[PDB]
Design a protein around this nucleic acid. Structure first.
Ligand SMILES: NC[C@@H]1O[C@H](O[C@H]2[C@@H](O)[C@H](O[C@@H]3[C@@H](O)[C@H](N)C[C@H](N)[C@H]3O[C@H]3O[C@H](CO)[C@@H](O)[C@H](O)[C@H]3N)O[C@@H]2CO)[C@H](N)[C@@H](O)[C@@H]1O
Ligand SMILES: CC(=O)c1cccc(N[C@H]2[C@H](N)[C@@](NC(=O)N(C)C)([C@H](C)O)[C@@](C)(O)[C@@]2(O)COC(=O)c2c(C)cccc2O)c1
Ligand SMILES: [Mg+2]
Ligand SMILES: [Mg+2]
Ligand SMILES: [Mg+2]
Ligand SMILES: [Mg+2]
Ligand SMILES: [Mg+2]
Ligand SMILES: [Mg+2]
Ligand SMILES: [Mg+2]
Ligand SMILES: [Mg+2]
Ligand SMILES: [Mg+2]
Ligand SMILES: [Mg+2]
Ligand SMILES: [Mg+2]
Ligand SMILES: [Mg+2]
Ligand SMILES: [Mg+2]
Ligand SMILES: [Mg+2]
Ligand SMILES: [Mg+2]
Ligand SMILES: [Mg+2]
Ligand SMILES: [Mg+2]
Ligand SMILES: [Mg+2]
Ligand SMILES: [Mg+2]
Ligand SMILES: [Mg+2]
Lengths: 155, 70, 119
RNA sequence: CUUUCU
RNA sequence: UGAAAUGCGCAGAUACCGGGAGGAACGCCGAUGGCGAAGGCAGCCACCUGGUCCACCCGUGACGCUGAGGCGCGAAAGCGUGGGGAGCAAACCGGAUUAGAUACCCGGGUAGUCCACGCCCUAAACGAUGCGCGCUAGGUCUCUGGGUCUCCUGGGGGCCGAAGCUAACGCGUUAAGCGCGCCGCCUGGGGAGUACGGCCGCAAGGCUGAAACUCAAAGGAAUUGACGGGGGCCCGCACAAGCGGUGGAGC
């Protein structure tokens, strides 16, 4: 991206709840181009949200994501000598990407043997505020702000 | 902005006692103003600085001030 | 200890540290802080953030003496400076005036090599 | 940042 | 300080207010400014004193220019005698950095830097341009006189530029143009500002200044490039942001 600012690749709304953000997630779930298996998983997982709570899946997922978004992060930085960890605000896009990236990595760290379950529980835990995703995140928000001395670059 | 010379009538700038006049030629930090500001002829500005320096020793004018709200 | 309701905040910004010292209106110090008195040590005392924390600490210790307002007096140019000021302002402590009073020779003493550079 | 030599 | 450490600090430092001592240097004004023969000169006051510019066109009557040698002045550092010593700081004592670091950075620190008197006499002592005089378009900005003060006329400091000159760069009424006078100097590079001798100096050293040998160059200005731990503008899966790899195992 030397020249332009890159078009945000615009995404097919969801086949089922009609939401863009969901395909986005299904995609991060997806390996080796297998959108089918990926989508089973996310739907199968949404069904496990039903059976294990009177909650509508969509607004669980929505509110889980919203809980995993970092406000600030620490991007590394040269200072003609040293590389410092520099705290700075986080683009709405990047909030959303890092959220879904972490949801799925967090999911796949879990013990439960079947993907739809791990996806489901992690989601549940996250809306509640205590998924492994949110620790890999308060971890970030911590490290920025714990480096708040260097907030006087930002670049 | 507007020149300090242009804001006054006649005045003897050999006059090292007229602190009322002299004092508008100083800055908010009691520093002799440059010609860009004083609006003076070179020759005048020479004579000024001399008589400003006299007032100062007389106690009548400041060598310094401190800058207010900064 | 004594109740003084207003007095001076003396900021001393330098390229190595901000030190903020608070006094009664005759100039006797009540409390004081610095980048070192906060956690920091070494190069970090210089930061503007160090400045904020010291300004804030020293303002807190001063409100313990029932301080309400201050005349601020700044000296030296330094990263922490307008930051140290901005802290005091927004600290509960009320800032009546701000004044640069940085001391400067009417050329007098030979500087160290490092500060001659303008030679 | 860092870079003596070739 | 890049980051540090040495260092100072509970015998209470730093930061803050009040009083005192001392030493050294004068901020703004301050300039693309002024003055001096050069070196060089900057708070303010007084005394002593050198130069120089303009107006009047009053006086003398070629009394002029240059100038070997002599004599005097001559930044800094250095020297002698005696003061003084705040800050800075060769040497030196330490801390960092580094492969090492007899340096660059940090902390100390003596001479010295300051004054008087006496030496030294050098310099990128540079405009790298000897002094004096006459002559050859202008324009523009500036300091300082005089006039009939829009404009004219002296003296000084800059910039652009006629003619012209220059190897070129550039110079160009402040000549490096056109001419005259008088002085100093040069005569390939290295050896060498060395050796010797003389003069001077308390010393440090200074002035004058070779030869043997040896090279076929040493140089100046400008051209095209190339390069830069120079500048500006800009690209590329170059890095960043991502997703999957190699380096591990067997094959
Ligand atoms: N400033 C004074 C003048 O300086 C010149 O020289 C004199 C002084 O400058 C010089 O120094 C004096 C000294 O007098 C006295 N004994 C000690 C005093 N500290 C010094 O003082 C003077 O010089 C120093 C230098 O920075 C500073 O104090 C300050 O600049 C000045 N007041 O000593 C010289 C005589 O003692 C001239 N001779 C004369 O015009 C006058 O004294
Ligand atoms: C500058 C930096 O990141 C850095 C890293 C490692 C070592 C160093 N060493 C530095 C080391 N402090 C050095 N000082 C220095 O650079 N300063 C800016 C004070 C010192 C004189 O030896 C240096 C010049 O050698 C250095 O810059 C390295 O070159 C600097
Ligand atoms: Mg520091
Ligand atoms: Mg070698
Ligand atoms: Mg004091
Ligand atoms: Mg000179
Ligand atoms: Mg006559
Ligand atoms: Mg006659
Ligand atoms: Mg001398
Ligand atoms: Mg000397
Ligand atoms: Mg001596
Ligand atoms: Mg050392
Ligand atoms: Mg040192
Ligand atoms: Mg020192
Ligand atoms: Mg010239
Ligand atoms: Mg002229
Ligand atoms: Mg020209
Ligand atoms: Mg020869
Ligand atoms: Mg050349
Ligand atoms: Mg070239
Ligand atoms: Mg990458
Ligand atoms: Mg392998």
């Amino acid at each position: 991206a030397r020249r332009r600012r890159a078009e945000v690749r615009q995404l097919q709304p969801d086949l089922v709840y009609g939401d863009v953000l969901v395909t986005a997630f299904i995609n991060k779930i997806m390996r080796d181009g297998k959108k089918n298996l990926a989508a089973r998983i996310f739907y199968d997982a949404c069904k496990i949200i039903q059976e294990k709570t009177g909650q509508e899946p969509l607004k669980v997922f929505k509110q889980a994501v919203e809980n995993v978004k970092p406000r600030m992060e620490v991007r590394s930085r040269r200072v003609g000598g040293a590389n410092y960890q520099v705290p700075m605000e986080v683009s709405p896009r990047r909030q959303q990407s890092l959220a879904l990236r972490w949801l799925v990595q967090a999911a796949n760290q879990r013990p439960e043997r079947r993907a739809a379950v791990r996806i489901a529980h992690e989601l549940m835990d996250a809306a509640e505020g205590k998924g492994g995703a949110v620790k890999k995140k308060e971890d970030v928000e911590r490290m920025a702000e714990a480096n708040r001395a260097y907030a006087h670059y930002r670049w | 902005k507007a020149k300090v010379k242009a804001t006054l009538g006649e005045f003897d700038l050999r006059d090292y006692r007229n602190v009322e006049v002299l004092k508008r030629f100083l800055s908010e930090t009691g520093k002799i103003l440059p010609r860009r500001r004083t609006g003076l002829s070179a020759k005048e500005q020479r004579i000024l600085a001399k008589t400003i320096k006299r007032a100062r020793i007389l106690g009548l004018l400041p060598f310094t001030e401190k800058l207010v709200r900064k | 200890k004594r109740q003084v309701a207003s007095g001076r905040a003396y900021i001393h910004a330098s390229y190595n540290n901000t030190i903020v010292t608070i006094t009664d209106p005759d100039g006797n110090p009540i409390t004081w802080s610095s980048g070192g008195v906060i956690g920091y040590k070494g190069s970090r005392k210089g930061t503007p953030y160090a400045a904020q924390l010291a300004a804030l600490d020293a303002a807190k210790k001063a409100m313990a003496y029932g301080m309400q307002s201050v005349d601020v007096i700044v000296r030296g140019t330094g990263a922490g400076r307008e930051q140290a000021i901005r802290a005091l302002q927004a600290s509960g402590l009320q800032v009546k005036s701000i004044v640069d009073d940085t001391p400067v020779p009417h050329n007098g003493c030979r500087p160290k090599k490092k500060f001659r550079k303008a030679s």
